[PDB]
Amino acid sequence: GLFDIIKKVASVIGGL
């Protein structure tokens, strides 16, 4: 039982 919401985000990823 978990709730997760990722919303209205923008990113410039130099890593990963």
Place this chain on the structure above:
Amino acid sequence: GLFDIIKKVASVIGGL
């Protein structure tokens, strides 16, 4: 039992 919200965010990731 957990609630997580990540909202209206932006980033320039040099690490990772």
Place this chain on the structure above:
Amino acid sequence: GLFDIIKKVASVIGGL
């Protein structure tokens, strides 16, 4: 039981 909210944020990650 936990609530987490990350909201209206920006960062320039030099470490990680």
Place this chain on the structure above:
Amino acid sequence: GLFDIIKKVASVIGGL
């Protein structure tokens, strides 16, 4: 009477 010029721009909007 007004002049407006938005030129050579790029952005990563976390808000709005």
Place this chain on the structure above:
Amino acid sequence: GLFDIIKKVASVIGGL
């Protein structure tokens, strides 16, 4: 009577 020029700009908006 006004003149506005926004030129050669970039941003990572965490607010708004």
Place this chain on the structure above:
Amino acid sequence: GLFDIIKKVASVIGGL
């Protein structure tokens, strides 16, 4: 009568 010029700028907005 006003002149405004915003030129060659960058920012990482934590407030707003």
Place this chain on the structure above:
Amino acid sequence: GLFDIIKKVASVIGGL
């Protein structure tokens, strides 16, 4: 004789 490798990069250019 030179070696050049540009790898896994992303950018938001306000200039140029």
Place this chain on the structure above:
Amino acid sequence: GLFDIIKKVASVIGGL
């Protein structure tokens, strides 16, 4: 004779 490696990078360029 030179070796150059630009790796896992990101930037928000206000100048240039």
Place this chain on the structure above:
Amino acid sequence: GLFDIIKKVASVIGGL
């Protein structure tokens, strides 16, 4: 003879 490595970096350039 030279070796150069620019790695896991981020920046917000206000000058240049």
